[PDB]
Every structure is written in structure tokens, then in C-alpha cells.
Amino acid sequence: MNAIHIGPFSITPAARGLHYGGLPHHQWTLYYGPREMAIKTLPDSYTSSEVRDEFSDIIAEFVIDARHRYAAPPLAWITGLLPGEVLTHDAEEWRPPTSWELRHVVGEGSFTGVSGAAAAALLGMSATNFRKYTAGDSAANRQKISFAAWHYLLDRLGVKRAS
Amino acid sequence: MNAIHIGPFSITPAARGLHYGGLPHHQWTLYYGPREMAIKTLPDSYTSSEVRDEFSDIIAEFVIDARHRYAAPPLAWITGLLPGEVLTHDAEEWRPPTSWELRHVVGEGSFTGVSGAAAAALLGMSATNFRKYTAGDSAANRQKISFAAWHYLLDRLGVKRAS
């Protein structure tokens, strides 16, 4: 496979390839989480960066539509895509973000463009310690960001004021 | 002794008492950290709350003078009393606040009036865990608040915007 992950978006190749014009091909699907966004059949000689370029315009259109739909700090529209329980200031009913929810706001392909190391620096923590927030393959056994650090990070990123 | 601590202020009794009007007396000194603020000789039958009431007006005058001198969030003037290294957003040159600096902003006698348990709730942590930030008698071996939690707390208290 070797799926391509661009923030909260993913591009996945089909299990079984195809053949077109005497060359191997593959059907790639672009998803926003579970939501199927687009499909394109592309040659096998394509680098992953070439596939990312192929789907970048659909991603940018997603961003434009979300900016208009969820119109405050400059990136407040991102809060329209996050569940209320990760945004609430009631710590008793708050829950930490999932990896996908975090990748909405951290990562070069995130909607903020801020890398993991830069976000770690914004929180005063090492990049290796911040990497744990998206590490592993177990949601339940994955390091969770703290309430205070999450809301502080959302303030520093211009997504939601801590107020 | 049994000194009285009111946020960053302390009232200390003299080692050797005195006698006035056939009754035991003690000379109490009110300090703001190391700064001697006032002296009053008061009877031994005074409760600690009575001594606190005796010095409360001088404390309130301190607050008025600081509010005027360090005039933004409503309690921004408190930042005039805190060293720059605990206020800086450069995590590489930041240092955590001391217990005294923390008691500027947390505690019923602090300049915010917000209790330790309420501040803990503002940070999403238990009161017992927050108590560790002012526990013990060793500055070096005292639990330190994190960069993100400290700046988030200062934002939630109305002392300094996280921006």
C-alpha cells in the first residue's frame, strides 16, 4: 500500500492494480477521515509526491469550502471540524483529541501548516515527547495531550482563544 | 512563631515578646517577600485572623499602589511584580515560577483571589496535584509547573494573554 497522509487527509491505493496503455496503474482514493472525497487512476511510476500533487487541488478546495462554511482568531474555522468535547473549557467533560483530530492542527499537511517540532516548541516540550501524541497504532494506549497544553496550543496556533 | 501567609505577603512575630499594660504582647512585621512593609505591636490574646485584619489595610494600599504603578486583561498589573523570565514566551529562556511567584496569582490571599483548587480546576488537574507546586521546603526539589500550564493559567486568570 504505502498510503499518503496529509494532515487529516489520506490517499490510499487499491489492493489490486490495473493495466492501461501497456503500463501498470493503480486506483487511488482521497479520504477526509472516513469521508471518500475523490478517486483517480494513476500510473505506477508515480512518486508519492506526484500523487500528493495530483490530489492537492481537491484538498485546497476542501480548505476553501471549510473556511467559508465555518466563518475570532485567524484559523477559527478549524474549530468547525473538531468535536465539541475536545473544545470545551469544562475539564470534567473534556476529552483529549485523537491522533486524527490533532493532525487537523499539527503537521506540515495540517490546516495550520505548523510542524510537530514547531508545535512542541510552542508548548515548551521536546519534539520527541510531542511525537508520542501521534505514535503507535493503539488509540487507547497512545500518549494523550493534557487539557491545559491542548487549549494553550489552540491559542498559540490562532485556532481558539484560551480566554 | 506561626507566621501568617497571605499570598505573597507574610506577617512574622518577634522572637522575644514584650509586656504592655500587664499583658503579654508581640511585635509583628508585615513583609512583601524580603521587603519590610510595616510593624505593629499587638497583644498575645490576638487570633491570627485578628492580626491579618490589623494588617489588611496596608495590604490593600499595596494593591492600590501596584494597580496604579503597573497599568490588556483585567489583572495585567500583576505582571509588573513578576520577573521577565517567568513571563517570556521563549521556552528556551523561560524558568518556572517559584512558590512565592505562584502565590502572587493562586491562593485566597493572592492578588487574584482564586484558590488552589479553583486554579487546579482551571488547569484540568486535581487539587492534590496542584498542591505540589507549593509543597515542601525545598525550592530545588519542589514540583514545577509546566511552561504551557503556567501561561495557560495566566491567561485563564486574566493576568496575561497567551496570544
Author numbering:
A (entry chain A), B (entry chain A): 1 to 71, 137 to 228
From the paper:
CRISPR-Cas systems are prokaryotic adaptive immune systems and phages use anti-CRISPR proteins (Acrs) to counteract these systems. In the type I-F system, after pre-crRNA is transcribed, Cas6f processes the pre-crRNA into small crRNAs, binds it, and further assembles with one Cas8f, one Cas5f, and six Cas7f proteins to generate the crRNA-guided surveillance complex (Csy complex). AcrIF24 targets the Cas7f subunits by engaging up to five Cas7f subunits (Cas7.2f-7.6 f), sterically blocks access to the crRNA guide by the complementary target DNA, and induces non-sequence-specific DNA binding to the Csy complex. AcrIF24 forms a homodimer and further induces dimerization of the Csy complex.
During the process of structure determination, we found that the residues ranging from 73 to 135 of AcrIF24 tend to be disordered, with electronic density too weak to model the structure of this region. Therefore, we made another AcrIF24 construct (AcrIF24 Δmiddle domain, short for AcrIF24ΔMD hereafter) by deleting this region and linking the remaining two parts of the protein with a “GSGSSG” linker. We solved its crystal structure to a resolution of 2.10 Å. The structure of AcrIF24ΔMD revealed a two-domain architecture, with an extended N-terminal domain (residues 1–72, NTD) and a globular C-terminal domain (residues 136–228, CTD). The CTD comprises five α helices and a single 310 helix. In the structure, the two helices ranging from residue 181–198 of AcrIF24CTD (colored orange), almost perpendicular to each other, constitute an HTH motif, linked by the characteristic sharp turn (residues 189–191). In the crystal, two AcrIF24 protomers with twofold symmetry interact with each other with several hydrophobic interactions from their CTDs, extending to a length of ~113 Å. The results showed that mutating F212/H216/Y217 to either alanines or glutamates changed AcrIF24ΔMD to monomers as indicated by the assays of gel filtration chromatography.
